Amino acid sequence: AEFDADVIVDARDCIMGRVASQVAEQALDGETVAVVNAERAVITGREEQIVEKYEKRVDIGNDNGYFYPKRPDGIFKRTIRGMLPHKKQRGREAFESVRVYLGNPYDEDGEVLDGTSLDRLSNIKFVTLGEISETLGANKTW
C-alpha cells in the first residue's frame, strides 16, 4: 500500500532479465521503482529446462537455508537483487526502494522499458512467470 514510485514499469510481455537489469540500473541512481504485472513477465527458452532450474533452486537448502520464492512477486524481486550489491549499505537502500507487484495496483498504465518487449508473433519458446510459479507449486492468487 502506497509507494511513491518515481518510475512504474510494466513487465507484461517483457524479458524479465533485461528488465531487472535496467531497474537495478535506476534503483542505483536513487530511482524509486515499482514493477507491475509480474505474473505476465516472460523468460525465453525451453520450458521443461527453465523449470528444472527454478525447481532445483527450491530443493536447494539445508539448515542455514536458501529461501527461494515461488510467487512471481518474489521471483522477480530476487532476480533484481542479483543485479545489486544488496549487502553494501548503498545497494540495500537502492533495493529496498524498489518493489514488485502482482498486476497493477496503480492508476497509470506502467511503461515498457525500451528493448524489453518480446514479440509474440516471432517467438513461441518462452514462459510466463505465472506458469513457472504454478509449476513450482505456488498458490495462484493473482
Partner: protein
C-alpha cells in the same frame, strides 16, 4: 554390513516445541457440500470408559453382534457465536475484512476480551455484502467461545475464544445463515453440527511432559550389552559424521516433549447425550463428575483431562458414516480398582 532401518521418529511434527495456544487451531476446513453450517465445536476432556455396541459395519462378518469399544468422555456444553468475520481475497492471500457482533455477551466474556461498547453491525454488514458484489468475498467464519463455567469439573471460568468456519450452499446463503446464528445470542450446540455415527477430527494440545531424553522423545535405543554399563545408557552414538562438520536437525536430540498440537484424524462419534449416563463411580479421576451436554469419542483424544479439544467434521474420511449406532451398555464402574 549395516542392516537398513527407518529413522527414529517423524520429521513431520517439528519443530517439537511448546505450542502457542493451549487452544487448538485448525489449518484445514471441510468443503462446502450440503446446506449452510458451522464446521466445528469444542468441549473439555473428562475421561475413559467402554461402551458395549452392535457391530455396525455391513462388511464385518461379525455384523450385528456384541462388541466392546473404548470411549473418551468429553463435555460439550453449548458454545456461543459472538460475531461474523469475513475475509476478502487479495494477491497476498486472505485477510479479514470486518466483524459483525452482538450485544448479548456472556456474564464472563470480559475475563478474556475487551467486550465491545459501541459497534456498527449494519455498516460492516453493508461493507461485507459490497465486497461480495465486487467478487472479492473469501470465506466466512464466526468468532466462537465457550462456557467453562458450565462444566463444574473445569476450574476455569475465563472463556476459550476461537474461530470456526461456516460453509454452506452458496456464499449468500451462509452469509445470512451466519448473520442469523449471531443476531440472536450465538447460542448453538453439538447436535446442531454433529450427529452420532459420523466421523470427526479431534484436534488438541497433547499432555505435556517437560524436557526428555531422545529415547523417550525419538524412540532411539538405550545402549545394549556391555555398552550399557559404560557410562552412557540413554544417549546416541553420535551427533553426526565428520563432514559435514556440523550437527543436523534431522538428528534426534533432547528437548520439549508433549504440549504440542495434534489434529488426530477420523474420530467416530458414538453418541451425543446429556445427563450422567457416562459418569463413573467414585468420579472421573483427576477430573470429577459429568452431568450435562456431552459427546462420546471412540479411542483416544489429545490432551489430559480438563483440556479444551475442538471438533470438525472429518475432512478426509475413509468410511461412509454409519449413523446412530446402537448403544447397549455404557460402563459406569469405578476407574480406581
Amino acid at each position: 554390513p549395516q542392516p537398513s532401518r527407518p529413522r527414529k521418529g517423524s520429521l513431520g511434527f517439528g519443530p517439537r516445541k511448546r505450542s502457542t495456544s493451549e487452544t487448538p487451531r485448525f489449518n484445514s476446513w471441510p468443503s462446502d457440500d450440503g446446506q449452510p453450517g458451522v464446521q466445528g465445536f469444542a468441549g473439555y476432556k473428562a475421561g475413559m470408559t467402554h461402551v458395549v455396541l452392535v457391530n455396525d459395519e455391513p462388511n464385518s462378518p461379525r455384523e450385528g453382534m456384541e462388541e466392546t469399544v473404548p470411549v473418551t468422555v468429553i463435555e460439550t456444553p453449548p458454545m456461543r457465536a459472538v460475531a461474523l468475520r469475513a475475509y476478502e481475497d487479495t494477491p497476498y492471500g486472505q485477510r479479514p475484512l470486518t466483524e459483525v457482533w452482538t450485544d448479548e455477551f456472556h456474564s464472563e466474556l470480559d475475563r478474556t476480551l475487551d467486550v465491545p461498547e459501541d459497534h456498527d453491525p449494519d455498516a460492516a454488514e453493508e461493507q461485507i455484502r459490497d465486497a461480495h458484489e465486487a467478487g472479492d468475498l473469501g470465506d466466512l467464519r464466526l468468532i466462537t467461545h465457550t462456557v467453562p463455567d458450565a462444566v463444574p469439573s473445569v476450574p476455569k471460568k475465563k472463556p476459550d475464544v476461537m474461530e470456526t468456519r461456516v460453509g454452506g450452499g452458496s456464499v449468500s446463503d451462509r452469509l445470512d445463515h451466519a448473520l442469523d446464528i449471531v443476531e440472536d445470542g450465538g447460542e448453538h450446540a453439538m447436535n446442531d453440527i454433529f450427529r452420532a455415527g459420523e466421523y470427526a477430527d479431534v484436534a488438541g494440545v497433547t499432555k505435556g511432559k517437560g524436557t526428555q531424553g531422545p529415547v523417550k522423545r525419538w524412540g532411539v535405543q538405550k545402549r545394549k550389552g556391555k555398552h550399557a554399563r559404560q557410562g552412557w545408557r540413554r544417549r546416541i552414538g553420535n551427533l553426526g559424521p565428520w563432514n559435514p562438520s556440523r550437527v543436523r536437525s534431522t538428528v534426534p536430540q533432547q528437548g520439549q516433549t508433549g504440549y504440542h498440537q495434534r489434529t488426530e484424524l477420523n474420530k467416530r462419534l458414538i453418541d451425543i447425550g446429556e445427563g450422567d449416563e457416562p459418569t463413573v463411580d467414585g468420579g472421573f479421576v483427576n477430573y470429577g463428575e459429568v452431568d450435562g451436554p456431552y459427546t462420546l469419542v471412540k479411542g483416544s483424544v489429545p490432551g489430559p483431562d480438563k483440556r479444551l479439544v475442538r471438533f470438525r467434521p472429518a475432512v478426509r474420511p475413509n468410511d461412509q458414516p454409519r449413523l446412530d449406532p446402537e448403544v447397549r451398555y455404557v460402563s459406569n464402574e469405578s476407574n480406581q480398582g
